[PDB]
Amino acid sequence: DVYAQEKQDFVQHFSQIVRVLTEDEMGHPEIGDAIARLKEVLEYNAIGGKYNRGLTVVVAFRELVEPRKQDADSLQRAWTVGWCVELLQAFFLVADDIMDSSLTRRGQICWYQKPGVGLDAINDANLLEACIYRLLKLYCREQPYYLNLIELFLQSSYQTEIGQTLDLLTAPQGNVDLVRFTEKRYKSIVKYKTAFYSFYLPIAAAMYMAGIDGEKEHANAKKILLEMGEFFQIQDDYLDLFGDPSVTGKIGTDIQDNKCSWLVVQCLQRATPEQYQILKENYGQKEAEKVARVKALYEELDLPAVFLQYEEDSYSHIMALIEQYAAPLPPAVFLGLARKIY
Amino acid sequence: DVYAQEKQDFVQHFSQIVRVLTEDEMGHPEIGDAIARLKEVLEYNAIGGKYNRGLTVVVAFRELVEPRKQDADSLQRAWTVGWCVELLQAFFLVADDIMDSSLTRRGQICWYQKPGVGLDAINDANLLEACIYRLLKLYCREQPYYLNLIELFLQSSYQTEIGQTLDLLTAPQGNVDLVRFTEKRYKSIVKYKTAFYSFYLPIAAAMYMAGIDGEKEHANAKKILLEMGEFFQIQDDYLDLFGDPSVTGKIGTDIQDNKCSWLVVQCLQRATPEQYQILKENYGQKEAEKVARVKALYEELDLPAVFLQYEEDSYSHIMALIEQYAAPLPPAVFLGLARKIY
Ligand SMILES: CC(C)Oc1ccc(-c2ccnc(NC(P(=O)(O)O)P(=O)(O)O)c2)cc1
Ligand SMILES: CC(C)Oc1ccc(-c2ccnc(NC(P(=O)(O)O)P(=O)(O)O)c2)cc1
Ligand SMILES: [Cl-]
Ligand SMILES: [Cl-]
Ligand SMILES: [Mg+2]
Ligand SMILES: [Mg+2]
Numbered sequence: 001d002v003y004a005q006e007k008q009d010f011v012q013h014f015s016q017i018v019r020v021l022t023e024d025e026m027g028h029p030e031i032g033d034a035i036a037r038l039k040e041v042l043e044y045n046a047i048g049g050k051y052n053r054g055l056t057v058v059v060a061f062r063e064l065v066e067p068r069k070q071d072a073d074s075l076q077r078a079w080t081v082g083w084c085v086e087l088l089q090a091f092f093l094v095a096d097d098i099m100d101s102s103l104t105r106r107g108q109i110c111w112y113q114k115p116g117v118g119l120d121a122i123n124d125a126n127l128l129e130a131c132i133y134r135l136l137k138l139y140c141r142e143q144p145y146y147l148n149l150i151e152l153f154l155q156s157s158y159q160t161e162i163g164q165t166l167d168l169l170t171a172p173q174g175n176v177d178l179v180r181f182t183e184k185r186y187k188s189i190v191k192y193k194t195a196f197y198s199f200y201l202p203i204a205a206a207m208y209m210a211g212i213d214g215e216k217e218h219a220n221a222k223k224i225l226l227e228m229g230e231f232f233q234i235q236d237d238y239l240d241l242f243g244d245p246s247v248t249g250k251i252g253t254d255i256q257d258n259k260c261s262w263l264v265v266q267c268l269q270r271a272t273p274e275q276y277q278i279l280k281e282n283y284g285q286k287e288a289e290k291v292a293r294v295k296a297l298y299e300e301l302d303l304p305a306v307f308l309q310y311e312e313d314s315y316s317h318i319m320a321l322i323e324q325y326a327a328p329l330p331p332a333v334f335l336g337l338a339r340k341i342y
Numbered sequence: 343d344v345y346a347q348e349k350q351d352f353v354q355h356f357s358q359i360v361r362v363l364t365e366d367e368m369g370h371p372e373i374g375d376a377i378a379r380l381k382e383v384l385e386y387n388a389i390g391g392k393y394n395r396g397l398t399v400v401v402a403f404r405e406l407v408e409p410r411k412q413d414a415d416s417l418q419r420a421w422t423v424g425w426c427v428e429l430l431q432a433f434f435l436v437a438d439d440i441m442d443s444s445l446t447r448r449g450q451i452c453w454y455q456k457p458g459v460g461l462d463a464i465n466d467a468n469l470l471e472a473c474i475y476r477l478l479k480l481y482c483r484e485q486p487y488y489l490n491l492i493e494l495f496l497q498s499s500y501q502t503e504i505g506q507t508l509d510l511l512t513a514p515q516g517n518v519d520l521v522r523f524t525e526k527r528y529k530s531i532v533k534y535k536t537a538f539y540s541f542y543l544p545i546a547a548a549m550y551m552a553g554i555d556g557e558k559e560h561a562n563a564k565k566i567l568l569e570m571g572e573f574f575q576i577q578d579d580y581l582d583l584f585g586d587p588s589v590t591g592k593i594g595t596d597i598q599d600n601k602c603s604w605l606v607v608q609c610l611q612r613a614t615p616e617q618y619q620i621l622k623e624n625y626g627q628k629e630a631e632k633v634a635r636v637k638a639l640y641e642e643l644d645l646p647a648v649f650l651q652y653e654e655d656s657y658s659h660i661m662a663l664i665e666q667y668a669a670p671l672p673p674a675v676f677l678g679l680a681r682k683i684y
């Protein structure tokens with residue numbers, strides 16, 4: 001497993017990230033207290049996950065750049081850029097958890113639920129985003145791909161926030177939205193909210209960093225990565241409800257939050273008129289007993305087994321796309337990622 | 343007044359901003375609903391203010407670029423970049439209003455307080471930020487100053503969020519923080535939270551757009567603009583409490599929110615031990631009668647008249663800095679802005 005190999009090292013480079021981001025304090029002591037808060041926000045919200053998106057940059061980089069070109073500086077930039085993807089994720093999750101009324105994340109209480117944090121987390125989240133661009137400037141400003149990386153991170157963020165917009169609009173609090181929960185809609189939501197930043201961005205970044213700038217090469221990689229991202233979000237939805245919370249580190253809120261989840265979409269395709277009514281009466285509400293009825297409806301329709309089959313067909317489909325579209329990139333770049341997610 | 347001249351026109355270019363930002367809908371109909379939400383967010387949160395920061399870009403641009411170089415394209419870019427500063431402001435204010443528990447902004451209920459919006463405004467706010475970078479790409483990507491503008495907007499945002507961090511840390515809910523409310527601290531907060539983005543950014547952008555890229559020229563402009571921004575935030579603080587809300591369009595929350603306001607700092611410098619105790623018992627709390635005691639303490643110490651004097655000395659001080667530092671830029675660039683704020 002190429003990720004488990006590169007990980008310890010990736011994770012160790014976090015203290016240098018924090019050191020470099022908290023050196024502004026030297027030039028300007030007056031911002032001491034803010035930088036201290038920044039460190040606390042980084043330590044709490046950037047550590048504790050699996051680091052798959054960040055590690056994808058490092059792994060891809062190693063596989064795409066001739067080993068003679070992997071000097072100490074180039075490696076450090078690679079890890080820095082991986083850490084940029086992780087900071088983007090931490091930005092996103094801190095704000096998402098507020099918007100989804102979540103309780104826990106990565107096995108600890110959500111940053112916004114900490115006493116004395118609350119809605120100040122809005123600013124915390126945006127500070128994490130700003131750190132991305134400070135890191136890129138600090139480590140990559142003289143590199144021919146600098147502008148490419150900046151634009152990629154900006155554009156990936158815009159797309160993801162369009163995603164999030166679709167997510168929120170399809171899931172209004174207090175309104176039954178079952179009619180809106182279609183396969184077509186679901187696929188759009190997850191393409192935008194998840195697939196661009198979690199799959200396309202880290203591989204593209206490593207591509208740019210290796211001087212692979214071509215529009216056709218990016219687009220082919222993209223065909224594979226967006227389908228992988230679709231599956232990853234579908235797995236995420238399944239795990240919100242059926243996942244083991246000691247493994248996931250997070251309590252589910254999709255049913256309560258009236259979300260267009262893969263589960264509810266599959267439910268809707270399979271439900272009798274009577275079960276449609278159970279869903280209609282119970283979905284999108286805070287009451288634990290109403291959430292449990294929805295779960296029981298999902299179990300009665302064998303949705304876990306529908307997911308298991310979907311995982312199998314999807315895996316095959318993605319492997320097919322790797323056969324079609326990897327070239328001229330090493331198939332290993334996509335395979336090691338698929339292994340990681342399936 | 344060069345602003346009142348350029349305004350109608352600036353404001354008219356907003357429908358083209360919205361048109362260009364909602365054309366993504368052509369390529370990708372699946373994001374139709376999101377783009378529609380984006381339009382509603384822009385219409386609600388980018389219109390209704392005075393447009394001073396955006397207009398500063400246009401005004402400065404006209405004054406800094408030889409009129410033979412002001413072709414239709416260059417003007418359109420100038421107005422576009424002004425609109426970028428306005429979108430940055432709208433981002434900031436939408437999220438700030440959530441964090442400060444505000445009620446109204448620009449004479450209407452705060453976007454987050456609208457029924458059916460609530461904390462979804464977090465995403466709305468970030469979408470406004472993303473629009474900045476999409477506009478820059480769309481209009482300025484081929485210009486020699488593109489990277490300069492991107493970095494300036496990113497860096498200005500980081501600095502402002504460091505500011506906001508200091509603001510929030512100095513003002514914890516439920517804790518007396520009087521000891522922390524010093525002149526030294528106040529000056530740092532406002533330099534970072536207000537002065538960079540509201541004063542330095544729009545003039546710098548116009549500078550870059552005119553090919554004025556030099557470090558010394560930017561730094562001189564900066565000496566003038568950050569002192570102007572300090573005064574603007576001090577005026578903002580005074581107006582939170584003493585301003586006429588039919589003019590300001592916003593209800594004050596500084597005392598309730600336990601803020602390190604210029605008012606409270608001036609109070610602290612002038613208070614007897616007994617008045618110190620009144621402030622200590624009444625500051626930073628939601629109760630209307632406790633807020634009214636604080637106001638009455640401010641009036642008893644003649645703080646409105648202290649502000650009026652400060653406005654006079656500050657104006658003189660800024661004019662002194664214009665005599666020192668404008669050159670080789672036209673003094674009019676700084677004067678027309680000062681007129682606008684004082
Ligand atoms: C500006 C900020 C609000 O933008 C975003 C913040 C978060 C996200 C996002 C994207 C993909 N997954 C998540 N979180 C998951 P998770 O909460 O981890 O299950 P989801 O809530 O979609 O089920 C968040 C997208 C955009
Ligand atoms: C990421 C986002 C939270 O960052 C910021 C959002 C807003 C601000 C900011 C800066 C300057 N003035 C304001 N608003 C004023 P106003 O509410 O308009 O009186 P303040 O609340 O400081 O008295 C907001 C700074 C940063
Ligand atoms: Cl699990
Ligand atoms: Cl007034
Ligand atoms: Mg969530
Ligand atoms: Mg969510």
Ligand SMILES: [Mg+2]
Nearest residue numbers: 236237240254
């Ligand atoms: Mg989820």
Ligand SMILES: [Mg+2]
Nearest residue numbers: 438439442444
């Ligand atoms: Mg405010």
Ligand SMILES: [Mg+2]
Nearest residue numbers: 438441442509
């Ligand atoms: Mg504020």
Ligand SMILES: [Mg+2]
Nearest residue numbers: 578579582596
């Ligand atoms: Mg204010």
